[PDB]
Design brief:
152 residues, Rossmann fold, lyase (chains F, I, J), homododecamer, DHquinase_II_sf (chains F, I, J), DHquinase_II (chains F, I, J), EC 4.2.1.10 (chains F, I, J), alpha/beta
Chain lengths: 152, 152, 151, 151, 152, 149, 148, 148, 149, 149, 148, 151
């Protein structure tokens, strides 16, 4: 506690369709964009000596290749795989292959939606899972990650 | 009926392997190419004041990103997702995210093929589904779409 | 129509389709089964297709009409309605007379209860149309003409 | 805290959570349920949230506390522990009083036996946190404040 | 047997995450890289008048498009689809569309791993399947392919 | 003063056999005996009760179509058709008359194929196992629903 | 007539009847239903006793106490219908005939509500007919016990 | 011997036997099979009656009419084997013993044809042996009724 | 004049117990009685009928291998092995002799594990529930198939 | 000389009914009779045997919590709770006392919902079907495990 | 007492007990367990006979030979528990009561080991308690046969 | 072969494999089991592998041979044929003697009936070869040599 902390390098990965946040019927579904969420999250992290990086993609390969590039360079991942949660064994195997701990986040409550959304190829190997709490879910994952890495 | 119609903008999306149409054993499986089908369909649409656009891809992301780019620009989609019908939740979520009505088409009768082909991530949110009627399926979807948008 | 060989096509409609247009027409639609068949028969005749029709709430009347179609009808368009999910006997009647057919549904069965997702006909149909309303019968007619004339 | 309307929040903990910190603390952890609730109550008070708590191994005490919360509590945070997988009665108590809630688990249920993968609460919760240990209750508190104050 | 053989053109396809071979904890999981395996395999093939080509990708489309480009140019495929074995109907349909015989290989024993890894969209249409025998699996597939094409 | 209610009772296949075989074992009451009693009970509360029993699915479907805008409530025991007839479900939905499903026997005590009904989810409610009084209970429920008592 | 002793058992959450949004979900309380049913029974020389509880044990222990004291049970186990093998085995152990009643049509609700641990051993089941279901169960019990 | 009265019931589509591509699927018609079977029965003092129908009700109503009139039933329900609970309950209701017969081997066909609503309550089942299956069922019925 | 048919009857485990326990209850007929009668019936139609019953799966498999090019038709009651032995299925496929599956009891009236057979889909046909006459029916069917009568 | 063993027997719902109904049919032995006999058998081998039977799941959970660091071994018949109570599984795991699961009846001969136990995989072992002696067998096993005999 | 004749049957691979890594998996051999059990039985005037086999037929044929000769069977079918309908039908055919025993807790092992072809027709089942399970089965058999 | 320690390898073949090459050899193939084993034994000997073989239609002969292999055999290659899908006893024999093995099938089981898709051995095998015909045994031999010699 008394010493300066070591910088944590944390990567946030977002999957398909999350670039649409804030676009359709904003008076109904909300006005906050993904860029707004990540800007806020990057500032929150920087006040705790965390250098937060981000990629969102509709391209599964961009997410896989970014996980590979994270090897021995990133301390922790926060991932919202979106639709690829239910379909991508390749993302599971990238995360197991680089051995970086991660937390799974969803804006929506997947358990209140169709039954196909109730199965995740990541949840069993995640440190934990947050769903249904909106944009704050990313901040909760960041808080969890800092506490896990610094034992606080 | 008495007034000039408003132009309809319709996008046709084709998924993987449909670029192979007409290539293998044409005396056995048929000589018509996908370009032949789309040329004919584009002319059929133009005679009814429909501007028909098209993308075929083996790249799921190209299809997702084209759906995103369609937002507030396209009135209706006709999609043959091919193999991605059974696998792509991301395509389901792109179509729900942009809120454009669509019809699902297959050249083959999926119900006569393997059991994995009997489930579609699109069929329940499509306006309707055509399968097994070959290339004419696209024309039937176009006819349906014009009637739905112009109430005829 | 003149240069072509006449096609003989039978349309079969299952139970409850006689109710089309009856209840809350402002809500569920005004068009009757008679209206759909009149229009379809006119469309067929202009392409040298002689179109016959039977609708029934009696499974046997559909089976027996299929038997009577043997060596007399080129193509069948069938909306079996609720019998789609229940009638093995209709499947075996169609297999027994070996006439190609298309399955049509007005509604999108895939958007409805899971018991409607299974058909005893879809695997042996030439193809299936669902969810496009009454134009689905015209699409089936168009498809049948193209198949039998190679056009 | 001053400018805000006070929130009344109830935390409910199910069976066996009273054992936290008791067995092999060097191995499974030292922190007790009392330690988690003391900290959580202090965190709530600084944001003008009055936080009440009940833990029980008695399903009825949880049901009856939910009934007593009607028209008196704004939000519930619940870790039903083993009752997550078994108690339809707790589901119906929460539906019956119509208070929004968040489900929390210390452990990652998805990493454990398949019977723990099913919850009678998760579909009607506002959301679910699992696997993040005792900070999950604080995350649920943060979420509840943001939802009720639109912040 | 007495005549010179006709050259066989064989394509090896590798799916996602196989580029990680040899990288993590090599004293534990092994030091051999995918490039090491393919170099050895290409030399083994060249001594039997087989011209062996290779693509590994984390991009499903690169694998699909390479299969399409193989049409009437390649005699046989060896494929380790990795995670896409369990998920990609599109790869199944590319291989059926070009009608090139193939053998499925896995370094790991998929039957000893999670139940989702027990189903393959390729195994029923492969000539055969090798799993669990490590890098030699590719050599066994090559040996099998030569014998099938030359009737030896 | 009450407005007359018009109520139709529909009985499916094999219920015409009630009372016929080994009456000392399975009971002596016939379907005609149940319906005569029920028609009298209904008449005392200004309900005009009509009845069809059939082994012909079509006769039940066609009767339901003919009931449109003419009948206030249906009591149906579809017997074996409860587990097999989607067409009866769709007839009842298509005419939009409220109904109650009744079975003399406790279907939940019988083979597992009898545990599912194509009508139970869209019925007002379901009565099983209580013998012939179940039709009386259904009649009482229908009167209370239509007259808000 | 010989007096019949009949016990009505109600499971969890039925104490909430009539409390929330009464203009929407209904004004009748469980006490209203039981007071009416107790009167209906007393006019036919039936002594009707009642227990509603959110405590599974209270219902089990009441069933044990009914042994050789009660002629018939009417039970709405509410959520416990789908979960309590212990209630099934309490009813089988005391061998008192019973009818299962639900206010709501369980078949119209989620699939987990389609299965009952009691329905196969009940005399019969009534669902979806609201509070009159308890009256129909009482009528059925009288007819069975008095052969009328 | 005492005369036996035996009813043979045939379900849907069996009227098509012998009609389509006879060089491929066979020339024997249902009338050919039944005329032969009626003669085989008459030589053993069995009066054999027959109904084939595509109408489920005709088969149900024939079974009701058989009550206390017929000693044994042979039934090939064809497609109705897999679908008709009503036929099962008609046979259980009149309590006449019966054998189930199919011309084709249902076990070699699609999985929905593997389940019968009649097989568990039949005396026995014959499938796949063609038209001789009806003769074997007749032989079995004679042996059961005359204890031979 | 007919050509002689050579037919092998195979019986699986526990069928040697026929007739032994509580004969007044379960029957007095032994397997030897059934086979002696069947061998006589076959001989009258110029069929040479051979038999093996075993509790040893291998004795049945090895007999089927030995039948190759020597036996025209098999009648098999695999008893418990019907539900468990893929190896018997593959023996029969490997020698390509037509066969009929017979069971004395109605397997469809018994526990659900008895409802599946590794032989029924590749048999010419299946007879169950008709007691010892089922072997006679199978013999009649085999004669008719081989002689086109 | 042996060290005393402290052993707790837990009995779940409905076992208080043992011996009550139709004793000429279902048996006359009461739970009190079984426990008195078992307590005497344990005392002869320097085992102090305590007991709770309850229809209240919480009384069983709370007793298991109270056993922590005070009891060497548990014998539990959870009765109906065997098939329903994850909370009892988690109580037993949380105090880490070895246990044996016992049932008087053969659960495998009863309805399929009785075939699954939330305790059987984490028990030392399971005894079913052998009546009241099953508690004696569990006691013998516990003595042998704790004393390595 | 009247002498009881009791047969113990052991299935495949139980001959390996005590062979591999005895410091890890245990030193007791099957012959050690059976010699002790034979002595325990002989002190109670039980004649105990034993067969262990990797040959399914040897166990089936031994059960047939037990008919009217043996009062009770204790069986650990090992792998055959999950696979052998033939063993079930041998035990049902000779109608000798039996107890099923496993050394290991099958419920803690793979899901295919959770199902037994014998458990529903056994008198009872013992698993997970090691070699003492055979003694408990012997104690149970004595009590049943002598009403003690 | 000289510089290496000799490997002792056992090949086990299940039921019906004795029929290889017997029926319609022009159609299903001419090569016999004896031909495969002669060739395999020669291939082994050139790499200082002493190869023993048993084929049987008797499950017990396979079980007992596995028991007899304890502390005497380095590696097993097994084609259990139909017993792959049925024999828990063979699984437990191999687990009981703790000798590593490879499962081989001539045919592609995944292309055949669904009951052939499940193996009681595949999860505990070092690996599995199917569909490659008789060369699969040679591939298994090659794999075993590389594993035991670290080459």
């Amino acid at each position: 506690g008394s010493h300066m902390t070591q910088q944590i390098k944390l990567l946030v990965l977002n999957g398909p369709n999350l670039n649409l946040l804030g676009q359709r019927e904003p008076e109904v579904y909300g006005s906050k964009t993904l860029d707004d969420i990540i800007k806020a999250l990057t500032d929150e992290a920087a006040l705790q000596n965390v250098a937060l990086s981000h990629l969102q993609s509709n391209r599964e390969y961009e997410l896989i290749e970014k996980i590979h590039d994270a090897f021995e360079k990133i301390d922790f991942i926060i991932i919202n795989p979106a639709a690829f949660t239910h379909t991508s064994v390749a993302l599971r195997d990238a995360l197991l292959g680089v051995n970086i701990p991660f937390i799974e986040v969803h804006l929506s409550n997947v358990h209140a939606r169709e039954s196909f959304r109730h199965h995740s190829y990541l949840s069993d190997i995640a440190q934990g899972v947050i769903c249904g709490l909106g944009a704050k879910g990313y901040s909760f994952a960041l808080q969890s990650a800092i506490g896990k890495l610094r034992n606080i």
